[PDB]
Write a protein that binds this ligand. Structure first.
Ligand SMILES: [Cl-]
Ligand SMILES: [Cl-]
Ligand SMILES: [K+]
Ligand SMILES: [K+]
Ligand SMILES: [K+]
Ligand SMILES: [K+]
Lengths: 329, 332, 332, 329
């Protein structure tokens, strides 16, 4: 049966709430039928004011509140309406949540989930389109995941709620209404995706292509165009930004001898910069028949005009182009 | 024959109106409860509000047509504010607000064309389609800011420049009741008070004692449905800051129509006729149609200017696109 | 012979004292202006304050010796606060403050040894030397937070857990007058009030109407140099939150010595003798010397535990050091 | 004559203030004789309350104030006491300052300088030791510089004040009291370092070593140890994090065939990850006789204990080790 990414996250939170009374959800409009991007729809009706909690527009404050409640032993899901807005609360995420178990010598855990859409949307311009994967992924003490499809999002949100540390879940607003066929094993309330493990979405022999979030589907579309020419791409869905699954990536490159990384966020000091650096530092460097290359968003604040916006995010054609450049074809 | 001015007309030149008294916070004496309207000003305010009103209805049409994308925040119903405010200040004064800015872009001097064309994302928009609904700038108008609450410390900093520059200009810093709990707003109140900044902090309250939230900073609560009330409160507030007394809060209450209120005032006191006002309406409609036609016919900006205007006053340089083979020229 | 209790003594068992009346904000009736002190409690408070005092003087000695590095914020002179506060609450209640936390770590139950040894950065510190002066945790004590103002929303969130958990516990959330302009503090006031959180927001005012800054939240201003005044204000404030009335602000004024004030009270009312109190002093000094000797003799933590405790409840893993060849084991 | 890094920055601000009435300085304790890290000492006495302005502890607020004043045409130097504290104000830096000239279509410039110490200090623990070079460097619309010595700091602070866009100057608290011999050309009120250009601090033939801020001196010390063994390191002082001078780096690697990057900040998605990625993407990849490697801080929140702290930042020995590993010696 088909389930939208939005509905998968909602299943995951519903189940995690039902399963543990210490789990609660808080953020702007989470209790309202419409309702941010409608991801929490129905939850308030089922769980009430105690557990589904609308906040004022006070990001630093309600994120700090969420962190203290986790310190006190509760298990908050803190929704940022978009991650752009997390910047107002970022010291709470980094200095109060991430660093605390370490600084306390293992005494004070912080079982908090920060979630909400990250990166590009459609026509919302420069202040509402920023990708925070590299920023968060840089930080010791955080875990950072970036689901692409319905399975990714249900299983990572469930793992995130069960983790006993600060997990940043970077969702995607364009992905919410996208339907995917949902296997019985994903339907189960038992379904978890381990944090720190990539998924090979498509097996291949000629090139390793690694992505996260929505560009993953663009990577799969590029692959289908490419096989018609006898080029087999191995497509890897990172899932986790920190700790990323580099061994899965290296194994693949040792088989295919080529690598393109694909991301939506800005290129410099971005996710592909790390993957590239690790490839060059580890065992897979000697298996490269060509340098690795990066597909990214354009290195601009996001423009509004549609044509400009379309050309500020990686397209299937940009991926194919990069891949042919690397295979020299 | 020349013995009477060609512009001589049939009407009263001015009339005196009662305006609602403002609730006061830490002020002994508020704005006056009467004001004089001139025929000329009334016709001006009436045309301006009516233009904002038709512009915003038009924007909504285009938005429903999917020609405008992303956000499209409208100020229809609130025209007594942007027009009232404009009427109590000088062009050399400064104004910033959040994203519900189409009206202020107009009252601060951008044409309906530039405003709609930015909304529809075309090269003739006031930012060549780079910004869309939320980010429009104009002369001593500083947006058009999409992060709720962020504009209030910006406003206080523009006011610090006013004080720094010594030219007796003031800054009007607007925020909505939705943002009134932002902590950076209270940071700005405190620094504004400490430094006696000429900052009029304005809460646009759409429909909770906001004018008192500056605590030590004095406040007034104003009828934001009455252009004359807004005009006098503004004059009072601006004159307050200009005297060196520091910041002040103004809560504008909105929810009866502000255009109709002015219309009835003008007709009943014979400042203008029903017919004059209808002809203004007719001209306003033409202005909005020409603007909407241009906004929808105008082409998108060209792809080769994608990377333009990253930095001011720099040599040109290249920015990377979605891969290293895509390079965009950036020119200041 | 057994006919009289072995613990029978020569003194009064209790005395009634006058404590300064609190200025009130939005409260009809404040804490009482008299209180009863028992001999047993007085001796307890006297020993606790005296231990904090000698611990902080000792820390300062070690700091001047460069044995403590980085920050070393002291609370000497403020012992009526951490001890007074401890005295008005239960061990199952919760407390958080910023970096001036050595006293609260003690009153919340950490030994002088663990406290000094963390300061000198040794494996016997309460965090094995990972945190130093600013980051110490204890039972229902949440630091020990180095970013000014950041602890106040933390505190409000601990209070939300109190309310959520249903066990009538309250949270005391302390901040210094230096932080009283942090915007996230006003964000926390507003959410605390809206949700009726059992949060006692406490401003430690060292030497500006702070207890009124919660506006809608009621306040009291308290003499933070008088342990009895602090104790009663706290009891009143805690009972206020426990009744479901929501948050409250307490401003503790500090600058006459709080230990001397208690001492004179105890001697003049014959709750204790000069000699008993001197013997406590002697014992306190021994406790602080043993602790200082241990703190300076104790070794640094071992390099191989550098990467331990990044994550809770995880399998072990490896963290990278200054190059890819340096690998640290991380164990929860 | 010798001048401390602290004194060089202070010369630069003094001169830029004298030269333009629209320049002012604001931040916590900037007007007080002692006085953050004493970098602004003497300025208030010379320039008064109007121009040297103490703020309350209100980071988001006073950074927003500084940005609005720049929008209005003034030229603020906004001091963060440390960059750790910039996290409270980060939305102002990114969304109000960086993105504004672009979103406005070239209408609204933002001539603001954010400055203050960044990265590791001595014993101040995890909340006070964070390096923000990669974070800021990631952002379109910002310039980001990271001086090492007295010359770097005077010349970059002067260039920063003269730039008409948001420039983040990431200083170093350990470097402030370090004295360097100050050439006559640096003494001059005319002295500028162009933003976007690296400096070769030491010429060499066997290995390219690239660093920024204080580790640069560690790189020069490693080089001196190394030449005694016939290994000549070319040491490159980045100076600018964004836009970094990659052509200077590539030219060097095409000559030496080897590269080590050295930074203080966390390794993942850090500065060296970008340099590595660019090397692999450009013309210098084919000139590599060995993969490039990264020296960084340890991937932890900064611990307090001295031994732990010492082993959480790159040391001269860690640099030498990395270099020998790359040259296989
Ligand atoms: Cl019309
Ligand atoms: Cl002692
Ligand atoms: K969790
Ligand atoms: K959607
Ligand atoms: K500048
Ligand atoms: K120093």
């Amino acid at each position: 049966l088909q389930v939208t990414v939005r509905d998968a996250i909602n299943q995951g939170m519903d189940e995690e709430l039902e399963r543990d009374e210490k789990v609660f959800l808080l953020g702007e409009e989470v209790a309202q039928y419409d309702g941010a991007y409608k991801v929490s729809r129905g939850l308030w009706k089922k769980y009430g004011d105690k557990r589904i909690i609308d906040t004022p527009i006070s990001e630093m404050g309600f994120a700090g509140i969420a962190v203290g409640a986790a310190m006190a032993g509760l298990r908050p899901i803190c929704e940022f309406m978009t991650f752009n807005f997390s910047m107002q609360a970022i010291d709470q995420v980094i200095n109060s949540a991430a660093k605390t178990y370490y600084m306390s010598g293992g005494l004070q855990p912080v079982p908090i989930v920060f979630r909400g859409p990250n990166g590009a949307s459609a026509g919302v311009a420069a202040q509402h389109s920023q990708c925070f994967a590299a920023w968060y992924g840089h930080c010791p003490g955080l875990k950072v995941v970036s689901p692409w499809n319905s399975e990714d999002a249900k299983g990572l949100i469930k793992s995130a709620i069960r983790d006993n540390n600060p997990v940043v879940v970077l969702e995607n607003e364009l992905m919410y209404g996208v339907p995917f066929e949902f296997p019985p094993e994903a339907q189960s309330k038992d379904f978890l995706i381990p944090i720190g493990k990539a998924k090979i979405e498509r097996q291949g022999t000629h090139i390793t292509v690694v992505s996260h979030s929505r560009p993953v589907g663009h990577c799969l579309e590029a692959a289908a165009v490419l096989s018609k020419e006898g080029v087999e791409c191995e497509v890897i869905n990172m899932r986790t930004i920190r700790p990323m699954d580099m061994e899965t990536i290296e194994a693949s490159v040792m088989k295919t001898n080529h690598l393109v990384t694909v991301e939506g966020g800005w290129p410099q000091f971005g996710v592909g910069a790390e993957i590239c650096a690790r490839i060059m530092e580890g065992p897979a460097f000697n298996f490269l028949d060509a340098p690795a290359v990066r597909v990214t968003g354009a290195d601009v604040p996001m423009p509004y005009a549609k044509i400009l916006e379309d050309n500020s995010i990686p397209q299937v054609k940009d991926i194919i182009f990069a891949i042919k450049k690397t295979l020299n074809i | 024959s020349g013995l009477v001015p060609r512009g001589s007309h049939m009407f009263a030149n001015d009339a005196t109106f009662e305006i609602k008294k403002c609730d006061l916070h830490r002020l002994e004496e508020g704005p006056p409860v009467t004001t004089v309207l001139t025929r000329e000003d009334g016709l001006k305010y009436y045309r301006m509000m009516q233009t904002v009103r038709r512009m915003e209805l038009k924007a909504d049409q285009l938005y429903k047509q999917k020609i405008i994308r992303g956000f499209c925040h409208l100020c229809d119903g609130q025209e007594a504010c942007c027009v009232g405010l404009e009427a109590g200040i000088n062009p050399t004064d400064h104004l910033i607000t959040a994203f519900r800015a189409h009206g202020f872009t107009f009252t601060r001097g951008l044409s309906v064309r530039e405003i709609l064309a930015e909304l529809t994302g075309r090269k003739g928009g006031c930012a060549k389609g780079k910004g869309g609904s939320m980010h429009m700038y104009a002369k001593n108008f500083y947006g058009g800011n999409g992060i709720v609450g962020a504009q209030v410390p910006l406003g206080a900093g523009i006011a610090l420049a006013c004080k720094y520059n010594g030219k007796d200009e003031v800054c009007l810093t607007l925020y909505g009741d939705g943002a009134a709990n932002q902590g950076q707003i209270f940071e700005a109140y405190n620094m504004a008070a400490l430094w006696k900044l000429p900052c009029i902090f304005i809460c646009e309250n759409n429909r909770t004692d906001y004018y008192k939230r500056g605590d030590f900073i004095p406040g007034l609560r104003v009828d934001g449905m009455d252009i004359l009330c807004v005009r006098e409160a503004t004059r009072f507030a601006a004159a307050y800051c200009r005297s060196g007394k520091g910041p002040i809060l103004m809560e504008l209450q909105t929810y009866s129509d502000p255009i109709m209120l002015l219309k009835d005032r003008m007709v009943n006191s014979n400042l203008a006729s029903v017919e004059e006002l209808k002809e203004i309406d007719v001209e306003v409609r033409k202005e909005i149609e020409d603007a909407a036609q241009f906004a929808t016919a105008d082409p998108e900006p060209p792809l080769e200017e994608l990377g333009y205007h990253i930095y001011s006053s720099d040599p040109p340089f290249e920015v990377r696109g979605a891969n290293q083979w895509i390079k965009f020229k950036s020119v200041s």
